[PDB]
């Protein structure tokens, strides 16, 4: 039941560097590919099956493909504190940078590295015995994450096809932004992501900054702070396969009970409780208020008000010792709650997965050791507003043909520009027709 | 190789700018309150068959030519402007300039030849509703040259009476002939600056 | 080989199917009827050519 991971772009590889540390801490693996000699095991010899594999003598290696073109962060990992853990060959670093250019990421440089990463993917899959799905981690606002990521998505869909894909992708914020030419890359990668990735999970830099500002009490957060709770969210998502869950949901429950239409797969994410040490032991963490904070609009990784839309469906993964009576009462309270409104055609729309593993703590972190945690993945219809606002940004740039020559100097024409535009328009129409 | 060692430095970005021409039958092009145009594109502006929609909620499909000319055009505000077709016909020099059908809101339905407005051209213009039936308020055929039609024309009043002559919407002192066809009399003379100044009234 | 009775019976079946699909949703029936009429005119042209 192993799950493989692909990290594309500098953002993806940084998230992986900050997330595989969480995995190697959860499964008690020393940060050099081994277990401690003394019995310091939470329990089980296969809780780490989904991510690692023993080789002769306790030398586990992660099922990760860290693919990036420009080799400044790949070799940063290579010389970091994880050297005897990672596989020397999985860490694929190209020759030159993609430079915010979907063209250079997808046609010029991508074509000579996709077939090099694909063989390692094939070897990992053949080694795997019960492969479950793909988890992609990327940034649409850059070159390698958008271009190379979309190319790899297409060339894995053409080959494996049936297997599920979970794409954690970051988008630019409505106001806060770093790259100038990010709308072009965002729309171009969105067109590819629409019909290939099975389930798309969305992240936003400012939407994590403001949470780290209002909850974790940090007025100067950073990427090394966002990536930690991103790792927390993905761990909350994947804990069901790992640990013994009384009411647990494998990877296919997300697609089975949260994708009513194949076109509609775009999901808000939330995670409670985002608390630090100072207020942790002063507050009381209970399944009522943690869930309520999950469903409040101020604790979402996607900067978007769910008020403007209707929650189509939702999944709630619970960690720690939680008794199902309280979560059933909590979802009853949510159904009686007024502000959030559902489309009337879904009477039952709450999947409640539960596990028996409490959330982990990383030394030097911000979050503290807690009893229980909740991850809320909601297929709502407020994400059409996100796509429409990004499109309205794109229109002004495309009207004056700005930055277009950089793109078209490579194999990219204007036909795919227009087709990505109309694809986003069709997505807008679909979301609005879902409507009432 | 010889491919690299070629006069390509300046030429690379020159050909990139050329390839950024923004032409070809794009699937669509959008703005904010802009000219949503779908169709063939060349010469950096609308050129070729295609439909254009814009702020006036009027979705008209025609043959674009760089906006220095235009082919057959069908201009209409259907079920939103609430009118089936407002203009239908070929264009030349960004003007119909030929066979054209126009439909006012309720004023009239003009099907005829005309170049740069209705300043010249021979055709028909039923200035009344119910054009399928004789109940039409009137039917005029001849040379338009302004709102004052200013030419040799002829119109039927739908009561059977017909006018045949020179016309400046009236009152051009042009020798005309008018037929009381119902009665059986006819008046030939000069509509001098009015419905009547002189002439001869006779018995067909 | 072609037979007028075969054509008539198949046309009747198409009418019954389009009735069913219209009862489901009418727009599909509109499209099916338009497609029916279009290959009807095509076969009419072919018959004239023959």
């Amino acid at each position: 039941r192993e799950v493989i991971s692909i990290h594309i772009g500098q953002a993806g590889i940084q998230v992986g560097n900050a997330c595989w540390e969480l995995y190697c801490l959860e499964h008690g693996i020393q940060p050099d590919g081994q277990m401690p000699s003394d019995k310091t095991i939470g329990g089980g010899d296969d809780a780490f099956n989904t991510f690692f594999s023993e080789t002769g003598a306790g030398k586990h290696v992660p099922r990760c493909i860290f693919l990036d073109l420009e080799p400044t962060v790949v070799d940063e990992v290579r010389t970091g504190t994880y050297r005897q853990l990672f596989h020397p060959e999985q860490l694929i670093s190209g020759k030159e940078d993609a430079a915010n250019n979907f063209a250079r990421g997808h046609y010029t440089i991508g074509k000579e590295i996709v077939d090099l990463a694909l063989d390692r993917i094939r070897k990992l899959a053949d080694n795997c015995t019960g492969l479950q799905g793909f988890l992609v981690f990327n940034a649409v606002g850059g070159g390698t994450g958008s271009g190379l990521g979309s190319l790899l998505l297409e060339r894995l869909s053409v080959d494996y096809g049936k297997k599920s894909k979970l794409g954690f992708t970051v988008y630019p914020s409505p106001q806060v932004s770093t790259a100038v030419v990010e709308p072009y890359n965002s729309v171009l990668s969105t067109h590819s992501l629409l019909e290939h990735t099975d389930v798309a999970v969305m992240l936003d830099n400012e939407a994590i900054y403001d949470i780290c500002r209002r909850s974790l009490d940090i007025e100067r957060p950073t990427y090394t702070n966002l990536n930690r709770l991103i790792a927390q969210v993905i761990s909350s998502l994947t804990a069901s396969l790992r640990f013994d869950g009384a009411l647990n949901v494998d990877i296919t429950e997300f697609q089975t009970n949260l994708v009513p239409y194949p076109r509609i797969h775009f999901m808000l994410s939330s995670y409670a409780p985002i608390i630090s040490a100072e207020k942790a032991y002063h507050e009381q963490l209970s399944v009522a208020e943690i869930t309520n904070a999950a469903f409040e609009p101020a604790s979402m990784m996607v900067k978007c008000d769910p008020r403007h839309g209707k929650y189509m469906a939702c999944c709630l993964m619970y960690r720690g010792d939680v008794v199902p009576k309280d979560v059933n009462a909590s979802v009853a309270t949510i159904k009686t709650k007024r502000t959030i409104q559902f489309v009337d055609w879904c009477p039952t729309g709450f999947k409640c997965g539960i596990n028996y593993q409490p959330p982990t703590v990383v030394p030097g972190g911000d979050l503290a050791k807690v009893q229980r945690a909740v991850c809320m993945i909601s297929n709502s219809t407020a994400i059409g507003e996100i796509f429409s606002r990004l499109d309205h940004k794109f229109d002004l740039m495309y009207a004056k043909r700005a930055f277009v020559h950089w793109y078209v100097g490579e194999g990219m024409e204007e036909g795919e520009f227009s087709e990505a535009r109309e694809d986003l328009a069709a997505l807008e129409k679909d979301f609005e027709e879902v409507g009432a | 190789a010889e491919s690299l060692r070629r006069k390509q430095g300046d030429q690379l970005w020159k050909t990139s700018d050329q390839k950024a021409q923004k032409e070809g039958p794009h699937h669509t092009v959008y703005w904010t309150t802009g000219e949503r145009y779908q169709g063939s594109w060349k010469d950096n502006k609308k050129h070729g068959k295609g439909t254009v929609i814009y702020k006036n909620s009027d979705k008209y499909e025609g043959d674009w030519a760089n906006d220095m000319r235009h082919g057959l055009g069908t201009l209409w505000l259907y079920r939103d402007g609430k009118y089936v077709v407002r203009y239908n016909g070929e264009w030349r020099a960004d003007q119909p300039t030929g066979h054209g059908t126009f439909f006012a809101d309720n004023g009239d339905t003009y099907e005829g030849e005309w170049l740069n407005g209705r300043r010249h051209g021979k055709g028909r213009a039923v200035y009344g509703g119910r054009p399928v039936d004789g109940f039409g308020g009137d039917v005029y055929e001849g040379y338009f040259e302004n709102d004052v039609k200013c030419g040799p024309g002829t119109m039927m009043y739908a009561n059977g009476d017909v006018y045949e002559g020179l016309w400046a919407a009236d009152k051009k002192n042009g020798t005309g002939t008018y037929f009381y066809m119902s009665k059986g009399k006819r008046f030939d003379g000069v509509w001098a600056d009015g419905a009547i100044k002189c002439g001869t009234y006779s018995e067909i | 080989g072609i037979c007028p009775i075969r054509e008539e019976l198949y046309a009747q079946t198409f009418d019954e199917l389009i009735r069913q699909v219209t009862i489901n949703c009418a727009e599909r029936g509109l499209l099916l009827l338009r497609v029916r009429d279009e290959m009807r005119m095509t076969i009419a042209a072919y018959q004239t050519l023959y």
Binding site: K429, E433 | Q38, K49, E61 | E27, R28, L31
Partner: peptide, 19 residues
């Protein structure tokens, strides 16, 4: 199948035929 799907089929066929 959806009503949006069928109306978009109408639009697509008409656009492809307007050549």
């Amino acid at each position: 199948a959806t009503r949006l799907d069928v109306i978009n089929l109408q639009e697509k066929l008409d656009q492809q035929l307007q050549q």
